[PDB]
Amino acid sequence: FKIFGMPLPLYAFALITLLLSHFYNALPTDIVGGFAIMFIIGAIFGEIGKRLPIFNKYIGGAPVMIFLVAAYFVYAGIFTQKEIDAISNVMDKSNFLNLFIAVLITGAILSVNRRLLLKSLLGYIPTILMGIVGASIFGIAIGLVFGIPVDRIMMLYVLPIMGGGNGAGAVPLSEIYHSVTGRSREEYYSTAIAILTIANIFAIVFAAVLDIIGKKHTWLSGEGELVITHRETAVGLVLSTTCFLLAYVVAKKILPSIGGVAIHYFAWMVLIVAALNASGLCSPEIKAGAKRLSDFFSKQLLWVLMVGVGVCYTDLQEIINAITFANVVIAAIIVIGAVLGAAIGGWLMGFFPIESAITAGLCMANRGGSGDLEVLSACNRMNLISYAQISSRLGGGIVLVIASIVFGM
Amino acid sequence: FKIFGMPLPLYAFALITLLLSHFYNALPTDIVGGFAIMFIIGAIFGEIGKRLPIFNKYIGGAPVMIFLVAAYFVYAGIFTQKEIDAISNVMDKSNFLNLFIAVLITGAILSVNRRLLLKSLLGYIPTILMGIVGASIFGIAIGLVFGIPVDRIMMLYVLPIMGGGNGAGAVPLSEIYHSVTGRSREEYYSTAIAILTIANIFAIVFAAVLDIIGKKHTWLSGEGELVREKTGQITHRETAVGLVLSTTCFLLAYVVAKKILPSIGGVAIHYFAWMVLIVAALNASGLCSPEIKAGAKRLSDFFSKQLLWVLMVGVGVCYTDLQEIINAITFANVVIAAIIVIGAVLGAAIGGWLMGFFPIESAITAGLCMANRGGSGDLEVLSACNRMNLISYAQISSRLGGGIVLVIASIVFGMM
Numbered sequence A: 001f002k003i004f005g006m007p008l009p010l011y012a013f014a015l016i017t018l019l020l021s022h023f024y025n026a027l028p029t030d031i032v033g034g035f036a037i038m039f040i041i042g043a044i045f046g047e048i049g050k051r052l053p054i055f056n057k058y059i060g061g062a063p064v065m066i067f068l069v070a071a072y073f074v075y076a077g078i079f080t081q082k083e084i085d086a087i088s089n090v091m092d093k094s095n096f097l098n099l100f101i102a103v104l105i106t107g108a109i110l111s112v113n114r115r116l117l118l119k120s121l122l123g124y125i126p127t128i129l130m131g132i133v134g135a136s137i138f139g140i141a142i143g144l145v146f147g148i149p150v151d152r153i154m155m156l157y158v159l160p161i162m163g164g165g166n167g168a169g170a171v172p173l174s175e176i177y178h179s180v181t182g183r184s185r186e187e188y189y190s191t192a193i194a195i196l197t198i199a200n201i202f203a204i205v206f207a208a209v210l211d212i213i214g215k216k217h218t219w220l221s222g223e224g225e226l227v228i229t230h231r232e233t234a235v236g237l238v239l240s241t242t243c244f245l246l247a248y249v250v251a252k253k254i255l256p257s258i259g260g261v262a263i264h265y266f267a268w269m270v271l272i273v274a275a276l277n278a279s280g281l282c283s284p285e286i287k288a289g290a291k292r293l294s295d296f297f298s299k300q301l302l303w304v305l306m307v308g309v310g311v312c313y314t315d316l317q318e319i320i321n322a323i324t325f326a327n328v329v330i331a332a333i334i335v336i337g338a339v340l341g342a343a344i345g346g347w348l349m350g351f352f353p354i355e356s357a358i359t360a361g362l363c364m365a366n367r368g369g370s371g372d373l374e375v376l377s378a379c380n381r382m383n384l385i386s387y388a389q390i391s392s393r394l395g396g397g398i399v400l401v402i403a404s405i406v407f408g409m
Numbered sequence B: 001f002k003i004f005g006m007p008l009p010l011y012a013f014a015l016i017t018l019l020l021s022h023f024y025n026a027l028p029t030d031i032v033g034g035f036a037i038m039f040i041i042g043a044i045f046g047e048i049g050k051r052l053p054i055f056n057k058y059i060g061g062a063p064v065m066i067f068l069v070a071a072y073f074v075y076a077g078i079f080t081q082k083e084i085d086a087i088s089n090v091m092d093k094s095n096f097l098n099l100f101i102a103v104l105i106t107g108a109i110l111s112v113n114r115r116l117l118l119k120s121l122l123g124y125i126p127t128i129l130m131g132i133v134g135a136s137i138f139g140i141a142i143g144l145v146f147g148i149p150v151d152r153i154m155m156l157y158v159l160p161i162m163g164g165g166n167g168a169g170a171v172p173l174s175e176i177y178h179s180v181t182g183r184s185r186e187e188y189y190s191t192a193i194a195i196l197t198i199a200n201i202f203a204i205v206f207a208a209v210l211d212i213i214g215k216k217h218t219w220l221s222g223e224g225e226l227v228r229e230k231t232g233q234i235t236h237r238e239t240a241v242g243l244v245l246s247t248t249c250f251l252l253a254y255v256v257a258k259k260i261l262p263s264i265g266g267v268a269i270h271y272f273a274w275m276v277l278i279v280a281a282l283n284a285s286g287l288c289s290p291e292i293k294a295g296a297k298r299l300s301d302f303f304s305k306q307l308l309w310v311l312m313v314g315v316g317v318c319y320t321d322l323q324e325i326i327n328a329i330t331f332a333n334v335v336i337a338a339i340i341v342i343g344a345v346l347g348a349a350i351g352g353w354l355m356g357f358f359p360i361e362s363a364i365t366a367g368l369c370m371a372n373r374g375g376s377g378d379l380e381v382l383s384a385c386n387r388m389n390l391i392s393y394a395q396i397s398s399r400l401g402g403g404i405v406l407v408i409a410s411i412v413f414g415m416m
């Protein structure tokens, strides 16, 4: 048998090396050192989670293993500080996370027809709002079951969960909280960041549950649907970065906010890439290159990404500081409110309920971009990255406008 | 026609974006921001270097353009501080340079037969020594033509040039200078780092000259070769496993050169040198199936053919301070340095010819790759003669051959 397309004997060589670097405490805190550890660790736990009987269900087993396992390694101090640093240097300083998402978006968007583009976006945004309504309705419902005043349910539970994640919700929602109340950002942030991560774990769990239910009741699922020389693949990489650059320059210095909403650079990228598709500036050869590149990331490096995601974007200590029976239940139900909210809305709009609940439901309640990858990898619908981003970025910018209003009153 | 396989209209989109990021001064100082700029800049100047007859000869011209051009952009302050930072963050903090070399080495070594491995290394090291001798003989010869005492020619000119580059020569040769003399490291380093970079530019130039001469006089050249069962399939997995092996092998080598076997004897073995022995061992062990062994090759191709232009943009930024060069571009140093390089060329040419290697390739691997700025240099040189597949050999000289210069140094320095 083979591991991660590596035969056992060979994997041993690497697994041995990992441990030599580990116990000798010798590791370069850079790309090389990072991918080295991440590839090996991800490989084993990927396979393990790929074949755990109960633990591996559908396709959403493999990644969730690496993801959760990696977090347990940080919390239990299993990683050394240099190892955490190496991985962190790849995910943040070097910023592999964005690149990864950037590659995906480009590859996913450049593969579809131009005619089909504008058809979706018009019916999608309403679905997102439908999800929020359900997220609020259920939250308040269960909230009063816990004897918790409505305002808090919206300010400390609903809004932050549906928020566009750490940078997009906790970073700015604490800012709006301080601007309107005057109370410390920390007071809010700490509670928000903690609870949103709880829900993020539920989102990833229900993503696999809807997968099972989707393949059990085909009528609800769309089965992954809502509605060449290297040079070609290399050009895909160029377009992935260059498109992200443009979007960045737009959200920072040109068109940071269209109106009362602040448009996150990833949201612009979607409109930039989509525009680039419709412009047909990219030949079908190149448009494939972007697809093929996207595959390489989503199929080879997905395990690696999870090792990084389970390290940086999952502080298990802060979760524990808020894992009172109350928060665990309240948070979960809010997520289910989002599921049913986006399911109903999408069904009415013409989308498949299962995919609608993931893209316009779970992808809202998750920890934004890091979250989307965590969720989408759990339902094996990684090809919906583009949609997931709309909710986390644009749909996140929506939560802010709503937040100011609710916070104000 | 197409700028880096991109039609002119599309390239415009990117080239426009680059300039928007530039003038608005908005750029993420990370991988994404880096590759974005590097890909675009490299693309145009890559094409341009090749297009001009005088500017480019054969396939040699493309990289040297990006390389030199990129340095001129830093010196002339054409790049913004954030842009230099972005590129620097990719090359150093993120350490793309090593990865790149790591991928190459792995792909090059895992492609050859196991029987053929040990045949070369035994005849190579002597050739390196032959190159040094010629590098010293010529240096002293021209040195006395400039009325410069021999000791200095060896301490401030020869040794540092042949040194294993910045980290390997200037960083440690100034250390040996201070241990034996007692005089400041700066005094040495500043002069050494300056002059070695001068020679590094000559090395890259003669690499293309030997290319022309090699294809003009085929008898001297091996056409990419120093020395005179079947893949069934390729999977990304297979290519992906190549990437794993590239990193995991570098890790092991690193753990060996730091905590296990830093120095075999009087020589300190740089981690890259170990990697060569680790990968070579891994080949002979056959732990990797031919499918995987190809994956490493294919991965190597992707870097050496797609990302080579990108690398140069980074190499021309970080590892080429044009201001310190100017601080030592006296007619004297320019000439003395150049001739030392030519001494290395002829030294490694003669030696290799006697050992059984092709003179042209021998002069590049055991000659110019010694006098260059180590690893950054090898890539600069090997891309100039289009013999990128000799990375493995170039590394032996820059790392192991560099560890040799140190032992020699302590003796010469001690002698005073």
Ligand SMILES: OC[C@H]1O[C@@H](O)[C@H](O)[C@@H](O)[C@@H]1O
Pocket: A108, A109, A112, A224, A225, A226, A227, A383, A384, A386, A387
């Ligand atoms: O739903 C239409 C299309 O949208 C794209 O963004 C996704 O990448 C495809 O999987 C999907 O077919």
Ligand SMILES: OC[C@H]1O[C@@H](O)[C@H](O)[C@@H](O)[C@@H]1O
Pocket: B108, B109, B112, B224, B225, B226, B227, B389, B390, B392, B393
């Ligand atoms: O010279 C023998 C072989 O050495 C390897 O390291 C190179 O990658 C090959 O190009 C060459 O054929």
